[PDB]
Amino acid sequence: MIKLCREVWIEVNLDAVKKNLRAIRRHIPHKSKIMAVVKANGYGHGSIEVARHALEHGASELAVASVEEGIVLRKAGITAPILVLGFTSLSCVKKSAAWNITLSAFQVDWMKEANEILEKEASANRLAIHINVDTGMGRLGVRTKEELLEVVKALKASKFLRWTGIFTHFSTADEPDTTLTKLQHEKFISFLSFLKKQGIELPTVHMCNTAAAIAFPEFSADMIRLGIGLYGLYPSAYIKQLNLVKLEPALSLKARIAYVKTMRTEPRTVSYGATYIAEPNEVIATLPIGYADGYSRALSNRGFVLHRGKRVPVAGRVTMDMIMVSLGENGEGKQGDEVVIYGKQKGAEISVDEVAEMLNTINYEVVSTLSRRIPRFYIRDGEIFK
Amino acid sequence: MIKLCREVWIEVNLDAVKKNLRAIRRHIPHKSKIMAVVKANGYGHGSIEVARHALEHGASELAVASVEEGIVLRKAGITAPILVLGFTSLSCVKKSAAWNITLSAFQVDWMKEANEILEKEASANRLAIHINVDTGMGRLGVRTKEELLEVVKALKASKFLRWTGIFTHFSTADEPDTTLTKLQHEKFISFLSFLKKQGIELPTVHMCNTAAAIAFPEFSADMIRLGIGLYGLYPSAYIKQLNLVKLEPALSLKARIAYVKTMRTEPRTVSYGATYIAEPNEVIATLPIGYADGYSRALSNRGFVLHRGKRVPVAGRVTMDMIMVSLGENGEGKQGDEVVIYGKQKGAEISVDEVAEMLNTINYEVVSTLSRRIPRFYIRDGEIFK
Ligand SMILES: [Cl-]
Ligand SMILES: [Cl-]
Numbered sequence: 001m002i003k004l005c006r007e008v009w010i011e012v013n014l015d016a017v018k019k020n021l022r023a024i025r026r027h028i029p030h031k032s033k034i035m036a037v038v039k040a041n042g043y044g045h046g047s048i049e050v051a052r053h054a055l056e057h058g059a060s061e062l063a064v065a066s067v068e069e070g071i072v073l074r075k076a077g078i079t080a081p082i083l084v085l086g087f088t089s090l091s092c093v094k095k096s097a098a099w100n101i102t103l104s105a106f107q108v109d110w111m112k113e114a115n116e117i118l119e120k121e122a123s124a125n126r127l128a129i130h131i132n133v134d135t136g137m138g139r140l141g142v143r144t145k146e147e148l149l150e151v152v153k154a155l156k157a158s159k160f161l162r163w164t165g166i167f168t169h170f171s172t173a174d175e176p177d178t179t180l181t182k183l184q185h186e187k188f189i190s191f192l193s194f195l196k197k198q199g200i201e202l203p204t205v206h207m208c209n210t211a212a213a214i215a216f217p218e219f220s221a222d223m224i225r226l227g228i229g230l231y232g233l234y235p236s237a238y239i240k241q242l243n244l245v246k247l248e249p250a251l252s253l254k255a256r257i258a259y260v261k262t263m264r265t266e267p268r269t270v271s272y273g274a275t276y277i278a279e280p281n282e283v284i285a286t287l288p289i290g291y292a293d294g295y296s297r298a299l300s301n302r303g304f305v306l307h308r309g310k311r312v313p314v315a316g317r318v319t320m321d322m323i324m325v326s327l328g329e330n331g332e333g334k335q336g337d338e339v340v341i342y343g344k345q346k347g348a349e350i351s352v353d354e355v356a357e358m359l360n361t362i363n364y365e366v367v368s369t370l371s372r373r374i375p376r377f378y379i380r381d382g383e384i385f386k
Numbered sequence: 387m388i389k390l391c392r393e394v395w396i397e398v399n400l401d402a403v404k405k406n407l408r409a410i411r412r413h414i415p416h417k418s419k420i421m422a423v424v425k426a427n428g429y430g431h432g433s434i435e436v437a438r439h440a441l442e443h444g445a446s447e448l449a450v451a452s453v454e455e456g457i458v459l460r461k462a463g464i465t466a467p468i469l470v471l472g473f474t475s476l477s478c479v480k481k482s483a484a485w486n487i488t489l490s491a492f493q494v495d496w497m498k499e500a501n502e503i504l505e506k507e508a509s510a511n512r513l514a515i516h517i518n519v520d521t522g523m524g525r526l527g528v529r530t531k532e533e534l535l536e537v538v539k540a541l542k543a544s545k546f547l548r549w550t551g552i553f554t555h556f557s558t559a560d561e562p563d564t565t566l567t568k569l570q571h572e573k574f575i576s577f578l579s580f581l582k583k584q585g586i587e588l589p590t591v592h593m594c595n596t597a598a599a600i601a602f603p604e605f606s607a608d609m610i611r612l613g614i615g616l617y618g619l620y621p622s623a624y625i626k627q628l629n630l631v632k633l634e635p636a637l638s639l640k641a642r643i644a645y646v647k648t649m650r651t652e653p654r655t656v657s658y659g660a661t662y663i664a665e666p667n668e669v670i671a672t673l674p675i676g677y678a679d680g681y682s683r684a685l686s687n688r689g690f691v692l693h694r695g696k697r698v699p700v701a702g703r704v705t706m707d708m709i710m711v712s713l714g715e716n717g718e719g720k721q722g723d724e725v726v727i728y729g730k731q732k733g734a735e736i737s738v739d740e741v742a743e744m745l746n747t748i749n750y751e752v753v754s755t756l757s758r759r760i761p762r763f764y765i766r767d768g769e770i771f772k
């Protein structure tokens with residue numbers, strides 16, 4: 001089984017990941033490609049094994065948050081295109097060209113300076129560029145067709161850059177009111193059409209995230225960017241209730257009980273602040289996960305974990321490295337028992353959507369703040385590896 | 387200055403760690419050693435460089451959450467004693483003896499099993515053990531004098547273990563009500579004196595955290611465990627208000643503006659959910675930090691950052707890798723401008739403590755969930771490195 005000194009770990013089910021890709025591949029047009037988004041350590045799931053697996057099973061490109069995340073995938077042996085979705089400093093142009101990481105860019109000046117850095121070094125690859133068109137996200141990208149033309153001309157003139165994509169991001173494709181999504185789409189389409197009647201041939205057009213690919217597959221164009229759906233999580237309850245694509249959650253968080261005790265002697269106080277007094281024959285188990293792992297301190301006296309198919313409440317405050325749970329009066333549990341923090345156990349389930357609802361956040365945050373000091377184990381074809 | 391592809395980073399001021407150590411050193415009895423707690427990646431500050439500096443400037447021993455965290459320190463050359471505060475599986479007894487990591491234990495079965503594991507391996511290293519006495523934290527550790535005596539006996543009868551410490555943890559030493567802190571101390575003393583009355587000589591006795599080292603320095607005994615105070619952060623407003631010791635915060639969290647734009651064209655929506663709509667002449671600056679870095683999504687439309695010495699509000703929802711801030715109508719910013727997320731800038735300051743109140747949590751969680759994908763830079767004698 002799993003041998004740890006500190007007995008907490010994550011299981012990422014790569015069979016779920018494969019299934020999530022085939023579901024998306026079969027929903028969207030057959031012409032359209034899939035870009036798997038493995039930024040932020042694969043939304044907390046591990047970027048290397050999820051990328052490796054997604055490229056095996058439907059994906060042809062990868063997207064990350066930064067050059068460094070991209071280089072980690074190159075060092076793992078991955079030769080697929082890697083697109084950086086955020087901003088990359090000019091000081092990393094040489095390094096991105098060296099690792100063949102595709103950069104997002106959306107400014108004329110950035111293009112020219114990037115091109116000179118690369119020509120002043122000669123012995124270079126050409127740097128691939130995707131243009132980010134901002135159609136309503138308000139984050140990064142060009143916002144007018146005149147500015148976009150300025151950028152495409154600077155890029156087309158730059159001998160050491162290469163134009164391989166143009167994209168936009170929908171900010172509300174996960175919501176039932178579609179008016180803003182439809183507006184983003186026709187803004188984008190009108191921009192691409194403006195470029196076409198200049199006689200500018202277009203590269204790969206991509207615009208859909210998980211929500212837009214499920215809800216508007218006709219927006220798939222050349223490529224979609226599969227993020228949250230890849231991990232078997234729906235972008236929102238609304239997208240989930242559309243019941244168009246069946247996704248299967250990939251991540252489970254588990255631990256083993258570190259210690260069990262009956263609270264016979266005084267004081268029967270539990271954890272910092274003594275916010276929880278146990279009963280004389282109440283049984284308190286101590287678990288080796290804490291808020292420094294990403295298990296929110298807000299789950300103090302609120303959270304549940306699965307122990308032997310039953311939900312047992314977190315007792316007292318979450319500590320940096322450990323939590324106490326109440327097994328009840330004369331509760332049954334032994335040191336070493338397997339506890340499920342996120343995931344399924346026997347009948348019962350604590351999904352990350354539930355923990356995210358209970359914390360007034362979204363599943364995206366619950367999984368991508370899972371600390372890297374938690375080891376990740378991958379299940380593929382029933383069997384565990386690392 | 388600092389050259390990053392993704393222009394976010396942490397600065398840890400080791401000169402401030404030095405000062406916090408001296409401040410604590412003058413405040414506690416000369417007999418008592420200082421054990422620096424660097425568990426959870428040094429409370430998010432980086433375990434290695436903080437430990438190296440602590441041992442250089444007054445700390446004699448280290449404490450971590452797990453054997454894995456101790457091995458990281460040993461791999462970096464640190465030879466000081468290292469105590470694991472948490473529970474270590476029996477499957478790591480041999481590894482702990484090889485790396486000379488000190489474990490806490492509090493069970494007879496664990497002692498006997500740990501001993502025979504090293505026995506069956508003809509081990510030359512005796513495994514250092516500290517006994518954890520639970521006097522009201524209810525987390526780990528032995529709870530009665532009879533059980534503790536049996537544990538001491540099993541330890542002493544174990545030729546391959548070495549008893550190097552006994553300790554307890556204060557549940558509420560950071561609160562105005564000292565009732566439980568006095569009670570735990572009284573229990574702890576009575577147990578040690580119960581042991582001494584049995585012809586047992588005690589090893590290093592330690593019990594104080596930052597709070598109790600500040601508020602009850604007469605509890606210093608042989609050694610204190612300096613955690614949050616090492617990083618320049620007070621355990622509570624109460625302990626800060628007692629104005630007994632002057633701590634200097636060691637962490638700042640900074641970034642560089644990735645893009646600046648005036649929201650002249652429609653739509654003027656900013657970020658997911660279109661929860662913020664800009665004015666036609668409002669300046670929106672995009673920053674490369676997001677919830678996956680540890681910047682809570684709950685700061686959406688509520689947090690501030692420092693630009694040119696001014697607090698500017700987070701605009702719209704925090705996204706995984708980026709936030710948007712409003713520089714106001716006709717605001718002044720350039721791409722590349724340095725922004726302070728946590729810490730000091732010109733006159734102003736966003737302290738980790740303010741961010742913690744804003745999120746209904748404690749500074750421990752704000753700092754120890756700063757993600758590892760953010761590079762840590764170390765300032766020692768007013769000069770940076772990594
Ligand atoms: Cl964007
Ligand atoms: Cl404890």
